[PDB]
Amino acid sequence: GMWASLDALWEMPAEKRIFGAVLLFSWTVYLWETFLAQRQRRIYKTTTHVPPELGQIMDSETFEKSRLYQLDKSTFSFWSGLYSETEGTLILLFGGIPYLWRLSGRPEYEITQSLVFLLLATLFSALAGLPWSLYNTFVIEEKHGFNQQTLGFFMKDAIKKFVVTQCILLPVSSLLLYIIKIGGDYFFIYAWLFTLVVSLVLVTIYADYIAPLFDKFTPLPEGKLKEEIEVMAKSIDFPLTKVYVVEGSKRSSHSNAYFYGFFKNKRIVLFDTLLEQGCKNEEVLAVLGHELGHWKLGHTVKNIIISQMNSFLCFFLFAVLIGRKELFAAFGFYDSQPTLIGLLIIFQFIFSPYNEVLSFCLTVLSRRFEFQADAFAKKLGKAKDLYSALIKLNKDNLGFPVSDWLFSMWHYSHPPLLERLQALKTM
Ligand SMILES: [Zn+2]
């Protein structure tokens, strides 16, 4: 375990071998995902005719509208993905990150250098990706009539989100770096608990303060829908406070619905794109019954317990690997071993195989968690209304019913429409 790690090679290097290992993995994962992308792109180009099983789900006009849309999305997804994978590789090989660290110079001094390094890194991040983002909304989402955004709204929102990002990023990072540099030798427990507080605080704050800045939040008007939601909320013993209708129709024709809170103060959030055109009151309640299922089946609580179990395991292995000067020298840091750089190298590159496996396992769990929430909706009796809703929402978001099994197994957090509909038909 430790005696085998001290062995030296008279044929191969040490720091250079682990750096290449990072890039070799990053490219094999990319090539695996590109193979999967190619596999699913073939499905869109081959299946031009509507299947007999998916015949009642979408008509030939809606199916070809969905086919064209998913095809344009696949083409963009490749080139935008290829540019990113090339950029990451090139910045690493060219030695961007250490040189940027030198340029953000000239414990308080290191935290300041880290803070300005972060500010510049996210500035380049935002600007380099903005043309791709502008293309997706104004060419893909606009061609297939989803986008409702103007160039002004897109621009004003980009700055709004970028500013709010820094105002959260800068204080959290400066306080996080402080705990690692000051604390010890068990600094990882104090750093993990800080991120634990920051995570749960941002979860409750987001929809109540951060989210109403970018999108128009208004309380749901009193009616047949507003009354029936409260009846369902009291039935499941869900402590409902308020019901909101988000102006999602200002951005895109895409529908959404979720809940948020801490304990006795829970609130339901609906999109106007889901209520208007959208879904009928009977279908909306069934969609809510599914989302309320995640609350009742404790999917919400289980997902937090997994996320904090992952960060504990990560901060522990970080505390074990932060002392190793070999991983810093690998990426071009020879003169110093900075804390923020250590967080970047270990969490985003050394943990890359673990992070990829954990993500796959959580995607498998998410699919199982969705089926359980669909089974809960059937247990409420709204199985027939959810069956109709899932199809109507799929037609609204031009979702292709056919999908490559290997692609959906790896990527899809939600199981395929035909798989979800068959489970509801059986119930
Ligand atoms: Zn769900």
UniProtKB/Swiss-Prot annotation:
Signal peptide: none annotated. Keywords: Antiviral protein, Disease variant, Endoplasmic reticulum, Endosome, Hydrolase, Membrane, Metal-binding, Metalloprotease, Nucleus, Protease, Transmembrane, Transmembrane helix, Zinc. The chain crosses the membrane at residues 18-38, 81-101, 115-135, 162-182, 187-207, 303-323, 338-360. GO terms for molecular function: double-stranded DNA binding; endopeptidase activity; metal ion binding; metalloendopeptidase activity; metalloexopeptidase activity. It is a multi-pass membrane protein. InterPro entries: CAXX_Prtase_1, Peptidase_M48, Peptidase_M48_N. Zn(2+) binds at residues 290, 294, 370. Gene3D superfamilies: Metalloproteases ('zincins'), catalytic domain. Residues 1-17, 102-114, 183-186, 324-337 are lumenal. Induction: By type I interferon. The keyword Transcription does not apply. It catalyses: Hydrolyzes the peptide bond -P2-(S-farnesyl or geranylgeranyl)C-P1'-P2'-P3'-COOH where P1' and P2' are amino acids with aliphatic side chains and P3' is any C-terminal residue. It is linked to Mandibuloacral dysplasia with type B lipodystrophy: A form of mandibuloacral dysplasia, a rare progeroid disorder with clinical and genetic heterogeneity, characterized by growth retardation, craniofacial dysmorphic features due to distal bone resorption, musculoskeletal and skin abnormalities associated with lipodystrophy. MADB is a disease characterized by mandibular and clavicular hypoplasia, acroosteolysis, delayed closure of the cranial suture, joint contractures, and generalized lipodystrophy with loss of subcutaneous fat from the extremities, face, neck and trunk. The metalloprotease domain is constituted by the two C-terminal nuclear regions. Transmembrane metalloprotease whose catalytic activity is critical for processing lamin A/LMNA on the inner nuclear membrane and clearing clogged translocons on the endoplasmic reticulum. Proteolytically removes the C-terminal three residues of farnesylated proteins. Also plays an antiviral role independently of its protease activity by restricting enveloped RNA and DNA viruses, including influenza A, Zika, Ebola, Sindbis, vesicular stomatitis, cowpox, and vaccinia. This is CAAX prenyl protease 1 homolog. It comes from Homo sapiens (Human). The lineage of its organism: Eukaryota, Metazoa, Chordata, Craniata, Vertebrata. The gene is ZMPSTE24.
